């Protein structure tokens, strides 16, 4: 008895649609009984809330019909979707994301072996209860910490603060880590009855930064604003003033950082208590968006949003 | 005869203002005759165009009165100022930027040894003709490639695409590289008669991104917009449409990437020729701003702006 | 009340006698009641089996007299001593190692703040049951994965395969990981009655490698040989012949790699089952020696040695 | 017209006989007229002085018959062969080395695209006068700094101290660096009349290190010994005693480090002037051997060896 693995596709094929895959990568038949569905068909750069909501509901609904899920996803925004699923999926069976940095028609296309390794990962018993995983370049990465570090490299996906969970060699995984932050079925976040998510945008800080992007969001009634701060989540003066005001009138404000590794730490550079801001910790801006969006479905209180940022 | 080195301060002191430094770091007297001036006094997170213009003019004006310059600068935006100076400074004597990741009153403050090493660097003949340098954690980094990689680490400054120029051990530098792109006195950019710079902002791309930040900038008549794209400088649909429109009406649009290393490459993901967009290459968003600002003082033509992005 | 922390020194001071550490770093008083003892006084380059046996016995014996230990240790061999203790210490209270890349009298000496952070770590209840820890440059690292990456950098100590356990900001640790391999009280190794350890040596592979080093060890009767192989543990032919013969006549032979990251994997390059060799996995040559010495106190059978390499 | 590129093979094929490479990768035809020759056929683990001498003579002799060379070579010792040729080849036409981390029959085999990119590099006029190059994973690396960082990763090859020379995107190279140390036609080393090279061996340091390996080399009459030291080239006491004595009685002794990045610096840990030792700087043990072998063809004097280590 081979496990049953479902492949959910969100866009194009990564090994050169969706039931051609066993013909494209025959070696899959030796490790799993694979079924494919095309859930949506969208470029990863146009990824949106509604695809997220659809994916989390499909997985939650089909959890009992299958032994594990592999999701094919483009690489641009993989890190955002993976973290969203890591917080909202209530199946504790393996959920594994995979993509390809080189097109399937290129010489030395990475997608076939990536796909193989993702199925291997989803079929391994040891992969359960680790949260949502990304499998790229022979490495098993957790959905919270994983990000893309290079624009074109096949090795781009890394867990830049806390490292990978395991490495795969000839079909076996050497797991030496598991994430400590709460995920999947240990979260309070439940999207089964939601058709939309709170509105959260992102503004960038840099020298002589304009406050107009932040104003535009505030005027549109955004529920939350994440700042991609400079250094340890600092803000250009004018952006600071716009966001301090917005926080007093009830917009949730999260300080993150444009710096690619390390925590934006609480009350270090900025008195968060006083302005009602939240510090993102190791969550980069786009990940901090995901968590703020979910937090805002439970509460609008900054001090409770801070506690959520400290636990998930 | 020791060289004469001028220290230009832009904010607080990094070794625990500005003529206390020889009392704070006595070992400086053995390597140089140091003079200090406080040029401005601003936190690095509030760095702006007018401080840039002031610094470039002071250096250009005092070039003949001194043997090299060390500029003390906070770390948040060091990478932006360093690149601006690298394009606008016409002195080919050493210009060395330095800062500290830990406050001067902390245990194991990094600023004293950083300062020492920066003076060593500015005093060494071998440092001339390398463009503007950043000296942090015993390493000599070029102003184009240097960026901050971690929020709090003392080792945060790295040249993430092409590497450092030299390493410093016991007061000697082992230089094995020099930057190939044109800098300082080989650029056409001259700011001696400018009192302001063209207006360039930055917008971030992410899943379900709002086009309101980009619209706000367009409506304000910004000269240029830099996109912090996803992957190889891709854009969320709605942001794409707003920027394509703005490009046809004459706003300069530069595609960069929120991904921390690697080039945003020309005509790969997006038909730049067709929409009149420019690809940033290895320039991250905040560096791409600096170069676009300068480019816009010579030309508004996208194809000529592309050539500038390929040469500096 | 504050915890009681014992500092065991093995060498010279890393801040400022071991009983005056509280005078060098008076801030140690606010976080713990500190007692120091000098266990030995040697340079870390001269570290040896007799120091290791002393250290482990001392910790095992005094485990109940204290809330946690901090060991000051030279950087050259920290990574070897830390993995030895990680396998032999039967105390589940925090054991934390710490050193300094810069001499204590130098400008921007790193030791004081490293010492402080080590005591913070040893005092935190959360630090217990994680194995023996190395704290350097604001980072908590497990003793199995930690290694030195750079000859001189203060940020040298990294866990290159699996990452750090936590980061320290303002006296608080954000732990997001714990090691999965068995350590401390869960190992079978007990050194309380040992006065010496099996003789294990290391040979290097390279182009045109001499077999004389390997022969010299075999003729001297060494119990075990660790090969620092090329690539994925591969061996130059002369070295391979010598070691094949040694393994057939009773020497334990472990294939590791000179390459600084990744696993030397089992039956990939070399037929381990045929020759009776053992693959080190992610243990580098110096750490593979440590585990091989200990394995040899329990068994001389290669299959069982391999399993020990797969669990510890 | 297209350039003529010669591919010299040293082993098995990395894509798909060496005369059929144009059938394995037919896209090679659009960028060059390719000729292949099999110079030897061995595993890179078995690389030896006689192959090196053959390769360099062959390149020196055929320099005028071709526009550039590509050498296919196993990954285990690439970094040694590349630095040897970088010092001995007197052709200033492009010499490019290339291999594959995955077997040519495996899924997502890296060789074909690496081969293609190697030919692109050898054909680019800009690639000339940069020394011997390694092209792997879309990156052009100089033969002096390049090393393998990971046992299995396709992205393993990095220039860990000073960075890559350029990146390849869509058949175009963006070169931003060139090596400063002297190479190729600017070196004094000439192997055209040599049939053998001086005997240079490597010993490893670690806790409780045996001196037997070092004694075995000295008793066999080795011309030179490279110490893979701990930290900044430091030595275990027994190893230090043996090597001190060897150096006094005519053996050349170079201190390198087992630590994978940074310089082993001159008179810091060890008094080199007193013992007659030479510090390797940034050359790792296997590369220090290469330079030491060649230095010994010109001099046996330590001060002059040190200067050679400071220029090449």
Short mmCIF file of C-alpha atoms in Angstrom, two decimals, chain A residues 142 144-145 159-167 169-170 174-181 262-263 265 268 281-282, chain C residues 142 144-145 159-167 169-170 174-181 263 265-268 282:
data_model
loop_
_atom_site.label_atom_id
_atom_site.label_comp_id
_atom_site.label_asym_id
_atom_site.label_seq_id
_atom_site.Cartn_x
_atom_site.Cartn_y
_atom_site.Cartn_z
CA UNK A 142 8.92 25.50 7.47
CA UNK A 144 6.90 30.59 8.81
CA UNK A 145 10.66 31.18 8.29
CA UNK A 159 14.88 29.68 6.29
CA UNK A 160 17.02 32.64 7.04
CA UNK A 161 16.63 33.02 10.80
CA UNK A 162 16.23 29.52 12.25
CA UNK A 163 17.21 27.12 9.45
CA UNK A 164 15.71 24.13 7.61
CA UNK A 165 13.89 21.20 9.24
CA UNK A 166 15.49 18.48 7.11
CA UNK A 167 17.49 17.59 4.09
CA UNK A 169 19.15 12.48 0.15
CA UNK A 170 18.08 9.55 -2.20
CA UNK A 174 17.07 13.59 7.92
CA UNK A 175 14.77 15.65 10.14
CA UNK A 176 16.60 17.39 13.05
CA UNK A 177 14.22 20.27 13.79
CA UNK A 178 10.55 21.23 14.11
CA UNK A 179 9.06 24.64 14.48
CA UNK A 180 8.28 25.79 18.05
CA UNK A 181 5.70 28.44 17.15
CA UNK A 262 16.60 39.26 12.16
CA UNK A 263 13.79 40.36 14.48
CA UNK A 265 12.10 43.83 18.39
CA UNK A 268 13.89 48.79 21.33
CA UNK A 281 9.61 39.85 15.48
CA UNK A 282 11.22 37.72 12.69
CA UNK C 142 23.42 23.77 19.94
CA UNK C 144 26.20 19.36 17.87
CA UNK C 145 25.76 21.71 14.82
CA UNK C 159 25.19 26.23 13.23
CA UNK C 160 25.74 25.73 9.55
CA UNK C 161 23.33 22.86 8.74
CA UNK C 162 20.32 23.40 10.92
CA UNK C 163 20.56 26.90 12.38
CA UNK C 164 20.47 28.49 15.84
CA UNK C 165 18.10 27.66 18.66
CA UNK C 166 17.38 31.22 19.60
CA UNK C 167 18.39 34.85 19.57
CA UNK C 169 17.73 40.71 22.51
CA UNK C 170 17.87 42.85 25.75
CA UNK C 174 13.29 33.95 21.60
CA UNK C 175 13.73 30.15 21.28
CA UNK C 176 12.16 28.68 18.18
CA UNK C 177 14.06 25.43 17.94
CA UNK C 178 15.49 22.52 19.89
CA UNK C 179 17.79 19.76 18.73
CA UNK C 180 16.16 16.46 17.76
CA UNK C 181 19.20 14.19 18.07
CA UNK C 263 26.02 15.42 5.25
CA UNK C 265 25.75 10.31 3.28
CA UNK C 266 25.63 6.60 3.59
CA UNK C 267 26.30 4.31 0.56
CA UNK C 268 26.31 7.10 -2.09
CA UNK C 282 26.47 16.17 9.13
#
